[PDB]
Design a protein around this motif. Structure first.
Motif, PDB file in Angstrom:
ATOM      1  N   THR B   6       0.867  -1.284  -0.071  1.00  0.00           N
ATOM      2  CA  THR B   6      -0.019  -0.035  -0.048  1.00  0.00           C
ATOM      3  C   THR B   6       0.863   1.225  -0.081  1.00  0.00           C
ATOM      4  O   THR B   6       2.257   1.236   0.033  1.00  0.00           O
ATOM      5  CB  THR B   6      -0.798   0.124   1.322  1.00  0.00           C
ATOM      6  N   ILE B   7       0.121   2.326  -0.183  1.00  0.00           N
ATOM      7  CA  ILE B   7       0.933   3.552  -0.054  1.00  0.00           C
ATOM      8  C   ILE B   7       1.824   3.667   1.276  1.00  0.00           C
ATOM      9  O   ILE B   7       2.682   4.563   1.315  1.00  0.00           O
ATOM     10  CB  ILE B   7       0.046   4.952  -0.282  1.00  0.00           C
ATOM     11  N   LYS B  14      10.288   4.933   2.917  1.00  0.00           N
ATOM     12  CA  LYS B  14      10.690   6.281   2.323  1.00  0.00           C
ATOM     13  C   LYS B  14      10.681   6.417   1.032  1.00  0.00           C
ATOM     14  O   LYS B  14      11.742   7.200   0.406  1.00  0.00           O
ATOM     15  CB  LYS B  14      11.940   6.583   3.058  1.00  0.00           C
ATOM     16  N   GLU B  15      10.006   5.818  -0.014  1.00  0.00           N
ATOM     17  CA  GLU B  15       9.967   5.966  -1.253  1.00  0.00           C
ATOM     18  C   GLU B  15       9.014   7.105  -1.753  1.00  0.00           C
ATOM     19  O   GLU B  15       9.029   7.525  -2.834  1.00  0.00           O
ATOM     20  CB  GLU B  15       9.279   4.757  -1.968  1.00  0.00           C
ATOM     21  N   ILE B  16       8.105   7.432  -0.831  1.00  0.00           N
ATOM     22  CA  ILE B  16       7.304   8.754  -0.859  1.00  0.00           C
ATOM     23  C   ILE B  16       7.371   9.540   0.216  1.00  0.00           C
ATOM     24  O   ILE B  16       7.520   8.931   1.345  1.00  0.00           O
ATOM     25  CB  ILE B  16       5.892   8.349  -1.495  1.00  0.00           C
ATOM     26  N   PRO B  17       7.367  10.843   0.285  1.00  0.00           N
ATOM     27  CA  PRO B  17       7.463  11.693   1.353  1.00  0.00           C
ATOM     28  C   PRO B  17       6.296  11.568   2.370  1.00  0.00           C
ATOM     29  O   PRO B  17       5.145  11.212   1.993  1.00  0.00           O
ATOM     30  CB  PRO B  17       7.805  13.197   0.659  1.00  0.00           C
TER      31      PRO B  17
END
Ligand code: KAA
Lengths: 114, 115
Positions: B6-7, B14-17
């Protein structure tokens, strides 16, 4: 114990409640002012007045309330889902100063959660 | 992978902020992107559990740890007047991300019923 609140009285069996589940360390019972077709509480027998004063040593007990809550929800047929809630203090709308986990379902719950 | 698909797994790795409040070996707390109160954050386990309805008995300490971290973060963020913790399950619960998470909302009067 059970404490100096109405939930202590329920734990001690001094006043009636519709009990769903009990073990040596917690109690689940239907809320007297239900806000959904199914609305019950899971409470520890240990008197913790509010979640803000729980300690690390309480972690398993607090998780036990959630596991008991989800098992009771399944037993009560809440197969489309539900919402769990813990209220803290004035802004949280906490009504009794004995830690309690609400479990509500049987209707669509909306957003924001109050 | 560690953290799941999931997001929230993306956030854990830490692949998206994210705006992270607290992190340990078991969980992560970060601010919600769509706050419903002046303070609104999430506490999530690093172990992927899809929803509370499938949590195992052995997950008790972890689930409790989410609540302890939630209350500690609330105190550190100055929510001295209180707050509400919420777990959403499934369709009727309004769950949109299938990674178990605890909402913590505060900084205003919360109303009843809780949705
Ligand atoms: C919305 C729906 N009612 C809901 O509460 N779904 S939820 O699964 O129970 O909660 C997921 C929350 O995660 C939040 N979210 C989603 N994506 C992100 C990202 N990327 N960062 C931070 N927070 C996020 C979102 O605003 C929701 O409040």
């Amino acid at each position: 114990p059970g404490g100096d609140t109405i939930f202590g009285k329920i734990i001690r069996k001094e006043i009636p409640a519709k009990i769903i589940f009990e073990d040596d360390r917690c109690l689940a019972f239907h809320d007297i002012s239900p806000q959904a077709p199914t609305h019950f509480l899971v409470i520890p027998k240990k008197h913790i007045s509010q979640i803000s004063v729980a300690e690390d040593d309480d972690e398993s007990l607090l998780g036990h309330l959630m596991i008991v809550g989800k098992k009771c929800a399944a037993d009560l047929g809440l197969n489309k889902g539900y919402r769990m809630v813990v209220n803290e203090g004035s802004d949280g709308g906490q009504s009794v100063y004995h830690v309690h986990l609400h479990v509500l379902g049987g209707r669509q719950m909306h957003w924001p959660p109050g």
